[PDB]
Design an enzyme around this catalytic site. Structure first.
Site, mmCIF file in Angstrom:
data_model
loop_
_atom_site.group_PDB
_atom_site.id
_atom_site.type_symbol
_atom_site.label_atom_id
_atom_site.label_comp_id
_atom_site.label_asym_id
_atom_site.label_seq_id
_atom_site.Cartn_x
_atom_site.Cartn_y
_atom_site.Cartn_z
ATOM 1 N N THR A 52 0.754 -1.255 0.000
ATOM 2 C CA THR A 52 0.000 0.000 0.000
ATOM 3 C C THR A 52 0.788 1.313 0.000
ATOM 4 O O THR A 52 1.989 1.349 0.277
ATOM 5 C CB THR A 52 -0.942 0.061 1.231
ATOM 6 O OG1 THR A 52 -0.154 -0.009 2.429
ATOM 7 C CG2 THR A 52 -1.936 -1.107 1.220
ATOM 8 N N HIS A 53 0.063 2.387 -0.313
ATOM 9 C CA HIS A 53 0.555 3.771 -0.311
ATOM 10 C C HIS A 53 -0.612 4.608 0.204
ATOM 11 O O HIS A 53 -1.278 5.300 -0.569
ATOM 12 C CB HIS A 53 0.898 4.254 -1.709
ATOM 13 C CG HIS A 53 2.237 3.806 -2.188
ATOM 14 N ND1 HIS A 53 2.429 3.228 -3.423
ATOM 15 C CD2 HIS A 53 3.453 3.848 -1.599
ATOM 16 C CE1 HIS A 53 3.706 2.930 -3.575
ATOM 17 N NE2 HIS A 53 4.350 3.297 -2.483
ATOM 18 N N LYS A 94 9.338 3.363 1.892
ATOM 19 C CA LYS A 94 10.753 3.555 1.566
ATOM 20 C C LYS A 94 11.450 4.552 2.487
ATOM 21 O O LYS A 94 11.924 5.596 2.029
ATOM 22 C CB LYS A 94 10.915 4.031 0.117
ATOM 23 C CG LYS A 94 10.421 3.043 -0.927
ATOM 24 C CD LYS A 94 10.802 3.533 -2.305
ATOM 25 C CE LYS A 94 10.561 2.483 -3.380
ATOM 26 N NZ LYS A 94 9.128 2.200 -3.612
ATOM 27 N N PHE A 95 11.522 4.221 3.775
ATOM 28 C CA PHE A 95 12.163 5.089 4.762
ATOM 29 C C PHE A 95 13.630 5.359 4.444
ATOM 30 O O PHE A 95 14.383 4.453 4.086
ATOM 31 C CB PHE A 95 12.060 4.481 6.168
ATOM 32 C CG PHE A 95 10.668 4.474 6.729
ATOM 33 C CD1 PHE A 95 9.850 3.357 6.584
ATOM 34 C CD2 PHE A 95 10.178 5.584 7.416
ATOM 35 C CE1 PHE A 95 8.564 3.343 7.117
ATOM 36 C CE2 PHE A 95 8.892 5.582 7.954
ATOM 37 C CZ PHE A 95 8.080 4.456 7.806
ATOM 38 N N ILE A 141 17.116 8.437 9.890
ATOM 39 C CA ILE A 141 17.485 7.685 11.077
ATOM 40 C C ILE A 141 17.097 8.430 12.341
ATOM 41 O O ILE A 141 16.476 9.493 12.283
ATOM 42 C CB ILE A 141 19.009 7.421 11.140
ATOM 43 C CG1 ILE A 141 19.767 8.750 11.185
ATOM 44 C CG2 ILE A 141 19.450 6.552 9.964
ATOM 45 C CD1 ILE A 141 21.261 8.586 11.371
ATOM 46 N N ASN A 188 15.442 9.580 15.954
ATOM 47 C CA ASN A 188 14.097 9.805 16.439
ATOM 48 C C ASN A 188 13.142 10.205 15.341
ATOM 49 O O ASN A 188 11.948 9.940 15.438
ATOM 50 C CB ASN A 188 14.103 10.871 17.533
ATOM 51 C CG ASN A 188 12.913 10.748 18.471
ATOM 52 O OD1 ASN A 188 12.690 9.689 19.069
ATOM 53 N ND2 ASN A 188 12.146 11.828 18.611
#
Lengths: 267, 267
Positions: B60-61, B93-94, B97, B99
């Site tokens: 999904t998106h 698509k993280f 980095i 927090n």
């Protein structure tokens, strides 16, 4: 061997958004970008109200907000942006292409391209991210937009090789009308080839030790004399009892003096 | 020279979410992942209701949705997910980095970690993305979560070098309990060192030409015999008049037969 003044660069720069930012910097005598990573809109708006006069740019993470809304957060933010004359930079770090990034940038819940003057993107995905984001911007506003590339990462274990960095710089060259510069720790060159990249650098302090929890480690004078155009300061401006208004003036003066001093170089 | 059956891999896999997906694939006899990039929740839920029985995973998106809400979109989707027994994969698509990604993954408006069984991440940012996302997950749910790395990109101009791909594969090895596998076009190895990576590959057709607008180009049999574990199909399932239910069974069968045929290999 240094760079032209912000005033001169504003008059020469091919990018409308960069010419606008350079003019703000010269007008308000600031190269300070505030990074206010708070969790509520109330906090953000209060902090932004206090730093407004002292900043040229605000780096945001609205996706970190616990109560985001176009009416409750963006509407008031744009108001402050217009009232105090500073731009908005949503630090989303896009890393996709095609129709997906176009929508992640222009639509969804955050509708970033509708209000954010500037954003950033990774190079791994290729030049399609530049053209994709550019086109998406042209479709949702008539307002100028700009992109900052992340050619070199400072985190540990980053795969940001020299070969990777050159590949991303090459992507930035795709078009100087849209790609404004880089988030970097040093000069990325390009003057020889007719590019005037904006260098914005995070992790800046007056207290090198790391007194501010915004992750500060290099001094203002250090980075600015290294070719840095904008200093990004976070926690050091409002963290632990500090008065945002007092710290904003403190960093602004440090940055601007370091800049004027750099204009006095010849080598 | 081939891989074990899905049933066997489910029993051996160190990752709870991977073991769960392998069992779904064996139970339902599918290795089809549906990619439904529509703009409204109504469209999505209707399509998912239709493909539910034929898929093992839904990519999904939700950030593409024009009307996303936790109550109106996530609640009903999880219901379908449980009713038809398939997992949810948010293709975010993280690429950050600390927090910031922790919150972009676990909070904000989308609260992805609260409902998405699986997500993906880029390698440029270093191993901090793996640990950050893992920790963020552990803090918001007791439910098992998994990550897919993007070691090799297929877009034009990608900076996804062999050196970069090895660096990302190396990051995947950070821990086989969380990093489930890769979005890739071919095998990424690792069996020699005790890793059982799930290979999910997009751009698949029964019609190589490119009849489906989901960007299909290699055939199901082609990829599955190459070591591909899951086939990601988009437009070819519901585009231009096609009956989702009919196309879902069409791809499901092609994929399952290619798999059974692969289990018949010896080299």
């Amino acid at each position: 061997m240094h760079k032209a003044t912000y005033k001169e660069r504003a008059a020469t720069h091919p990018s409308p958004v960069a010419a606008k930012l350079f003019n703000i910097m010269h007008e308000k005598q600031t190269n300070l970008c505030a990074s206010l990573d708070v969790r509520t809109t109330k906090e953000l708006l209060e902090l932004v109200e206090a730093l407004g006069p002292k900043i040229c740019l605000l780096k945001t993470h609205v996706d970190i907000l616990t109560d985001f809304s176009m009416e409750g957060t963006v509407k008031p933010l744009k108001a402050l942006s217009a009232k105090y004359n500073f731009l908005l930079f949503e630090d989303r770090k896009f890393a996709d292409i095609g129709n997906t990034v176009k929508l992640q940038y222009s639509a969804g819940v955050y509708r970033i391209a509708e209000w954010a003057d500037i954003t950033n993107a990774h190079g791994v995905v290729g030049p399609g991210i530049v053209s994709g984001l550019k086109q998406a911007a042209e479709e949702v506003t008539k307002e100028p937009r700009g992109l900052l590339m992340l050619a070199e990462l400072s985190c540990k274990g980053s795969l940001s090789t020299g070969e990777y960095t050159k590949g991303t710089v090459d992507i930035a060259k795709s078009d100087k009308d849209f790609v404004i510069g880089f988030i970097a720790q040093r000069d990325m060159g390009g003057r020889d080839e007719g590019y005037d990249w904006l260098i914005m650098t995070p992790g800046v302090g007056l207290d090198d030790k790391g007194d501010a929890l915004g992750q500060q480690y290099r001094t203002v004078d250090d980075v600015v004399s290294t070719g840095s155009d904008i200093i990004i300061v976070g926690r050091g401006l409002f963290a632990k009892g500090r008065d945002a208004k007092v710290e904003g003036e403190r960093y602004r003066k440090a940055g601007w003096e370091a800049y004027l001093r750099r204009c006095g170089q010849q080598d």
